[PDB]
Design a protein around this ligand. Structure first.
Ligand SMILES: *[C@H]1O[C@H](CO)[C@@H](O[C@H]2O[C@H](CO)[C@@H](O)[C@H](O)[C@H]2NC(C)=O)[C@H](O)[C@H]1NC(C)=O
Ligand SMILES: *[C@H]1O[C@H](CO)[C@@H](O[C@H]2O[C@H](CO)[C@@H](O)[C@H](O)[C@H]2NC(C)=O)[C@H](O)[C@H]1NC(C)=O
Ligand SMILES: *[C@H]1O[C@H](CO)[C@@H](O[C@H]2O[C@H](CO)[C@@H](O)[C@H](O)[C@H]2NC(C)=O)[C@H](O)[C@H]1NC(C)=O
Ligand SMILES: *[C@@H]1O[C@H](CO)[C@@H](O)[C@H](O)[C@H]1NC(C)=O
Ligand SMILES: *[C@@H]1O[C@H](CO)[C@@H](O)[C@H](O)[C@H]1NC(C)=O
Ligand SMILES: *[C@@H]1O[C@H](CO)[C@@H](O)[C@H](O)[C@H]1NC(C)=O
Ligand SMILES: *[C@@H]1O[C@H](CO)[C@@H](O)[C@H](O)[C@H]1NC(C)=O
Ligand SMILES: *[C@@H]1O[C@H](CO)[C@@H](O)[C@H](O)[C@H]1NC(C)=O
Ligand SMILES: *[C@@H]1O[C@H](CO)[C@@H](O)[C@H](O)[C@H]1NC(C)=O
Lengths: 324, 160, 324, 160, 160, 324
């Protein structure tokens, strides 16, 4: 009569590495490395993202003629740009503090697009119907941004304009605009006459002034002229005044929004579906259960610390030594 | 292992024992078979379970957007951002890698220790009434029926 | 006759958590988490801080009429702003590189306030007694910053001024100034005549020039005009030259200081006492003995690494299993 | 524990022993009582003391001002500053949390190991001259007065 | 140590044994000398070797240029860069310092454990045929020539 | 007949520290702290660095008369500045985005210096032989930067110039230039006549314009005038146009380069030798075998994590307890 004390064994093939020895076959293990995803762009915390498709942030906000589906944009928890996101500033120029704007508009609660300065009578004694370029073509036709208005000259007179707007939207307003910079002084005058013009934007929290910086420069996608784009967040109850003698690509539409926090811009060509997720990446949604992940260094949300590891398997059972 | 029981003086595992991690196997005139020690197995589970939880539960993460976007005249802060990303991702790689390696060594030892304490738990009761065969087995100098086999399992083996 | 070997036990209730088991009662433990403070703002390393009270850094340095007690400021290891720190730029405008200045003036050894450009004869043939606004009211009366001088016009003439100052203080000098930006050109001329004025500050290490940026903008705490504030650290032996045809809010007083290192600005309404500390936080002084703390993420000095933990108790004794 | 002594084969602690961590309790015709083993207790203290010191002493910190201040057109570097703060404060939270958990497991085992080595230190001397009662107790097959009780404590127990 | 063998019940080391870490020393009518146990020594080496490798191999580093250069109007990001540098260099200092301290404790215990398992490996075979002298030595109750000494070394000691 | 089981011991003095006890003498140990170097500046990954010696980056790129040996610079994996690197902008002024340029030019594959705008006929009806100052003396003689050309006035006429350059180098081109800022308007006119001049640099990716900012300021190493230096990376196939009525320190030579990655600037007076290295520091080359180093916080390449430790010794053998 004998009794033996021993331990369990099974058909397990799981192997873990230990301080003293590699690939030790163990009976039971748990994985601590999330390395699989769903190749889908999900809703981050129950709030789908914003797809820009062929357009990029600049094209979307400015009103590039190719981003018309984006004129209804609403909610979104993070912005998605594609490898096709190329419709931006159809008219050459620097989008001032662009990175900064992209970063701040990452996450938005509400976002209403309203006509801040109506084209139809808002610019008396000023040409508001010529501001159309070929660089910004809309179906073969020459067009322009849908949120900005290119104010040209009335016949042969360009008087000093001065429109103010006070944000009574009960939330912040994103006002965008531009300053045109003719190549010479022949265009400078043929468009705004006053060869010495200026544009000044004033707010209780803003005051930078401008003057066209005419100069010779290479034509880009058509024009040798240039348009710098400027934006600003107008606090509630504050007033922003615009006034110029020329070179002002005035705001037509502004956005009334409610920023809650800030995420980022996922740029991937992966499909967007009605799935959810606490952590999102370019290749797809990641699980937020394990303490580490190796799917992508760039992630948005509450994510597992990214690591270069390929295997982080933890033993739970004992060494496996079968054979009967 | 560190306690000589696993793949040590009890060099093999029991495919036959399927109801627990550590346990027994008896053989008497009445028959034979395995019986996992439920207590030490349960306790081991609770511990390994609690251990995995800690390694996972203690990992705090807030809502973050790793990416940044810097323009061609911001290479320095872009490289600083890089340094931060590579920095943390070097700390978490070395840490995670070793946390596992080290904790794996600890879990196997733990199991080994549990087996050695069980084998020792028994050696204690049997004393003179059995001879040790260096393989984790005891051979009663007397007859030990199923009740007697049971008694040692539930730690109540008589006059030794 | 028997002898038993055993272990200690007591009435301890301390509980620690282990890898395998929670709340294990132990006989002796040590705490590794500093989670208590003294709800007091102490002297960081034997050098009391600087209280600004109702004022903020900008108001203190510029000479806001409400920060007169701060005209004697001396030493300080870190600056304290209160939830009442609101007396700053009583006259609307941007304080250029403000964050930067706040950061650099965090820690100061010596700091002497001297009259760099005396009001009384320093600006010949220039009005130096009208530069008083209502936005900067001093006891119902209209006043102005005490360290800056609003140079207006002499009768109906505003000639080109040009004062230089060479730092022979044997240490750095903090020179502050401002450029006024009238709303239109009626004020622009009624004050500095020359409707085309300019202000230029020159140093062996500085040269930015200015021109009033008149433009329509919302009135702030009174005026629609604006004043940008500029500062600069003038190295020993260097000379700073000022000269303008208008819109110059000239330096009246500058500060001769000795920066040793740099700390920060604690902003809290907690009481200040003659206590000391190696690590200071908004809620109070923290102990620098334990390796971790959870009192506040924001701290100044040599501090314990901040953690989200609430309990980091280390066992020193063995499990406690009494019962006799 | 890991060495079966604590809350193991010596399932209880001695409220009575008040001069040390590990020790003895005797009972002979002359009287009874406890006597902590001073050596192993001292050594254990030195070690636990030295251990706590390391965990505290090895924590280097230079004079730093964590806060920063960035204006509304510096959201990106402000978020980078954030990433750094959350980053380190995530590393130190996970690390501190586990350093304790892991070191606590190690300190208890350590104590357990000290008790088992003491019990074993004695089992060695007594050999045949005492019978083991599975509770950390030895019953001398002979009479052992106070000097004899002392002898085993100071490790000098005679012919076994 | 933690397993009582090193500087414990075998308080001294053998300068004489020069072919391994753990081993034997015999003394019989035929002569004496040392013989390191090759298996446990080899295995110990493989383990310590593999262990040092991990601590070194698991340290990932990409091409980085730590320095930055910020001008007098960039003190804030310069201090942020500083915070990052001091930050990581505080994490790696505390970590490296403790990784060693902790792993050193583990390596010594490991050795101690190896010695105790060897001494125990032998105590097993000899059983009744030798008496234990509390110093890691066994005295055969019989005569044990070189072949017999060998037999116990290569674990094949006869009827005990 | 007895057999004893024991352990090894030797004459080792190596001591390690453990959680429970300090300076434990061990039989065998391994060092995990790289704390020795070779007091030499090696080739980082088989590509020697670039020594600037008496010159600094600004002097090297601009063409300071003292950095003539640097006119052949080629390859380099990192830049070396010395405690003697002081020959930079011999003519006072701000080198715009200097840090940024230094950082971007850290590592370069190819780098050809070509004459983008030849002095000899490139500036018709413009004085191209007076642009020589004493601040930039070449062997007692008055000279100027070798890569920039100081275009002055032809007799008493300074017409509007306009040169463009299109990068057909099949790689990026580093174009450097400058804008002169006279102290007054007497020099402003004596040199460029047109007291109202301007300089405009245009590219498909650049457009900042300039106007001399004449103003009184302290003379530096000679002149009270100032020269701001500007650079730009001109993409392949892009065109950069220059045109001005004065104050333009035109590009003479530009650099055609191929950036692969980016390292940094080691600044040390240590000798440079034909050795190699994966990790380089100011004091010398460091080994990249151990996981930690304490030779220097500032390093370039794949380096061992820097630590404040002085001793990180790992035990491999057992405690050493000899005595026979
Ligand atoms: C927006 O982006 C598209 C896609 O880049 C622009 O079209 C470009 O690419 C087309 C090829 O797919 C070609 O038409 C041209 O290479 C180029 N556009 C031109 C110059 O025709 C498109 O023009 C952009 N739309 C606007 C107006 O912004
Ligand atoms: C400095 O700050 C105070 C406090 O904010 C200014 O007073 C403001 O708040 C007062 C209520 O407590 C009211 O008087 C006003 O809301 C406001 N000041 C005005 C417009 O009267 C105070 O004016 C400031 N002092 C100066 C001149 O800087
Ligand atoms: C480049 O740097 C040198 C060294 O700093 C300049 O010479 C300076 O130092 C010399 C002493 O070693 C002295 O000659 C002067 O202090 C100073 N130069 C002057 C004003 O003569 C040298 O001039 C610089 N060369 C140029 C033209 O850039
Ligand atoms: C392994 O054994 C399990 C029984 O626990 C069984 O369910 C499974 O199918 C087996 N698979 C393999 C690998 O044979
Ligand atoms: C373990 O061995 C090596 C590492 O030592 C590894 O590459 C391999 O995948 C493992 N082999 C198996 C299947 O056990
Ligand atoms: C606990 O016991 C100690 C004796 O060490 C005594 O001083 C203290 O008052 C007791 N407190 C409690 C909780 O009973
Ligand atoms: C331990 O149990 C839980 C965690 O397991 C904890 O919330 C509680 O405070 C502790 N209970 C006590 C008093 O021991
Ligand atoms: C130490 O002993 C070794 C033998 O392994 C010998 O080679 C060396 O010279 C000795 N050195 C000392 C310190 O005596
Ligand atoms: C160990 O002791 C102290 C630290 O405890 C250390 O300063 C010294 O260098 C060491 N002494 C020796 C030589 O063992």
């Amino acid at each position: 009569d004998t009794i033996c004390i021993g331990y369990h064994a099974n058909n397990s093939t799981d192997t873990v590495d230990t301080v003293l020895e590699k690939n030790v076959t163990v009976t039971h293990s748990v994985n601590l490395l999330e390395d699989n995803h769903n190749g889908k762009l999900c809703k981050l915390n129950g709030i789908a993202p914003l797809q820009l498709g062929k357009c990029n942030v600049a094209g979307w906000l400015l009103g590039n003629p190719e981003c018309d589906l984006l004129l209804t944009a609403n909610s979104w928890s993070y912005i998605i740009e594609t490898s096709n996101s190329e419709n931006g500033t159809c008219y050459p120029g620097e989008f001032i503090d662009y990175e900064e704007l992209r970063e701040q508009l990452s996450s938005v609660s509400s976002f209403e697009r309203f006509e801040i300065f109506p084209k139809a009578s808002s610019w008396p004694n000023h040409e508001t119907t010529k501001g159309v370029t070929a660089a910004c073509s809309y179906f073969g036709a020459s067009s322009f941004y849908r949120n900005l208005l290119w104010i040209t000259k009335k016949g042969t007179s360009y008087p000093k304009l001065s429109k103010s707007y006070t944000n009574n939207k009960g939330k912040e307003v994103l006002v965008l605009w531009g300053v045109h910079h003719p190549p010479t002084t022949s265009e400078q005058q043929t468009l705004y006459q006053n060869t010495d013009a200026y544009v000044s934007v004033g707010s209780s929290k803003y005051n930078r002034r401008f003057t066209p910086e005419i100069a010779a420069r290479p034509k880009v996608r058509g024009q040798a002229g240039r348009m710098n784009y400027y934006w600003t967040l107008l606090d509630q109850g504050d007033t922003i005044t615009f006034e110029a003698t020329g070179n002002l690509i005035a705001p037509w539409y502004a956005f009334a929004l409610n920023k809650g926090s800030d995420s980022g811009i996922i740029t991937s060509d992966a499909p967007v579906h009605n799935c959810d997720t606490k952590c999102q990446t370019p290749h797809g949604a990641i699980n937020s259960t394990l303490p580490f992940q190796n799917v992508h260094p760039i992630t948005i949300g509450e994510c597992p610390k990214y690591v270069k590891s390929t295997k982080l398997r933890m033993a739970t059972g004992l060494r496996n030594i079968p054979s009967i | 292992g560190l306690f000589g029981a696993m793949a040590g003086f009890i060099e093999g595992g029991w495919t036959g024992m399927i109801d627990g991690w550590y346990g027994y196997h008896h053989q008497n005139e009445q028959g034979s078979g395995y019986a996992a020690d439920q207590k030490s197995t349960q306790n081991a589970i609770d511990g390994i379970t609690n251990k995995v939880n800690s390694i996972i539960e203690k990992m705090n993460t807030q809502f973050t957007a790793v990416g940044k976007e810097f323009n061609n005249l911001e290479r320095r802060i872009e490289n600083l951002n890089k340094k931060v990303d590579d920095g943390f991702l070097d700390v978490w790689t070395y840490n995670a890698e070793l946390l596992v390696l080290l904790e794996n060594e600890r879990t196997l030892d733990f199991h080994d220790s549990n087996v050695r304490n069980l084998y020792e738990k028994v050696k204690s009761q049997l004393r003179n009434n059995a001879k040790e065969i260096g393989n984790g087995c005891f051979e009663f100098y007397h007859k030990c029926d199923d009740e007697c086999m049971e008694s040692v399992k539930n730690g109540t083996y008589d006059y030794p």
